[PDB]
């Protein structure tokens, strides 16, 4: 599968029934299917300051790069879900707008997803995939240069093709959330990728935050879906899905103006 | 195929390879736009149809208003002759159901005119998967004052409720659906945005917006079913719109700066 071609999300679903199911993510947030929700009370953030002397492993699988996350990270407020890995979507050069979420019709630059998994249920994220996930979504502007996403990007360049891995060294993961994480969207939607198990509950940030237009167009340039010997590369860009259809769902808000 | 649960858009590839392919629309239009100055007006000929009558059905997945093949569109390289209009809307709830957008923002509806090369062949049927085809005008629609004549046709609304009923609908000048200024208008090369898919559409999608009344909108969201009247499961017609495609390293043309 992929994002672009006869592989593409409109074809996904011939392989992967459940991408043409319900539930399905990303979606437009906008104010008819919103509503205030006062029990959505604050996330707690719980061991995401990594220490700078471990190391966590980026991978570039061909489809994402993901840097992957220690089972000690945690967020509650919800069960205690663990962190298992976070990775970003993005546009191309000439069209910095690839985020997959949308707000009022409108594209972010990009997005970080930071993907939890159910551990009081289950032993990883997997098992817990068909059943189980939570993830933060956060929006990303063209900004100021930011250097707690930089600890991630400038590492690109060593995990370029398919297959490859790097060591990122740890650092602390809240500086990669925006300003006021009591303020969210919340709703219930899926997977964003194959295989579109509608098992996550989404959490999506209200602020975004900045990442300069030089880190955008490294982000952009440096990543192929393809193997580093692969006759037909790829680029790994425009790596966003089409937002679905709001099947019925509305989509709850920590905050009421 | 529906616009829903398991065999909704996502879905659509399985049985039509086209809706999975190149040239989808409808798309977003935001500021990809390009003036080209051959993009001169067109001519509406034959709209101002005999006060004749005309069929209006409901098959199900639409309620369409057959046209006759006298009424053409002049301007563009071959003749295109009308074959039948037909409406997408969205849901009392969330009441925003066009299928192009603009700068990210759905309209209230959208009307589609479809035509065929009657120069190059005898039907739409057989047009619509040759090279030139088809010609669509499509007009934005958002709620405003109350308009006598898109009432020419939503008067009919209920004696189609379901599938498979029809009414008949006596001549008017179709040319009064069309919007201020239709010298100002996108164009690009795309397709049909239902099943089949197929990527033979010129798109024309006027830039002015008409206006419905918010009752006649209401109307058009809550008069029709995409069921027989004997089913024991209906189902309302809402919704029945595509979302919008990937367009990239594309232009849409503008007539106007
Ligand atoms: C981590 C729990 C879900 C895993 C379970 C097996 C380990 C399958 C999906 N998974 C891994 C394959 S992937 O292609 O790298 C990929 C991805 F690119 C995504 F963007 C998302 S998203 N946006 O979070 O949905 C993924 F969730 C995701
Ligand atoms: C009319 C030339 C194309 C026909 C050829 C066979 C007669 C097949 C598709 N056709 C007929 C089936 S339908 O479901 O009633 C339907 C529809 F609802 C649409 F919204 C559009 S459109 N204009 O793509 O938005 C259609 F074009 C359309
Ligand atoms: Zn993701
Ligand atoms: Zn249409």
Redesign the pocket.
Known sequence: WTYFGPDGENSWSKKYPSCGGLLQ?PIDLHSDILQYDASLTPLEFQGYNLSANKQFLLTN?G??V?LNLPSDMHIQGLSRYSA??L?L?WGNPNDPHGS?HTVSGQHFAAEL?I?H?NSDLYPD??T??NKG?A?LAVLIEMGSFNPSYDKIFSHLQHVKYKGQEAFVPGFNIEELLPERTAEYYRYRG??????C?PT?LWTVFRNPVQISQEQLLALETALYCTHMDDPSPREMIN?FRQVQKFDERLVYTSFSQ
């Open positions: 993510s699988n489809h994402s993901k298992t890995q990775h979507h997959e997803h993907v998994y994220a997997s817990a995939s996930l993830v899926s997977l964003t990728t194959p295989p198990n996550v790596n």
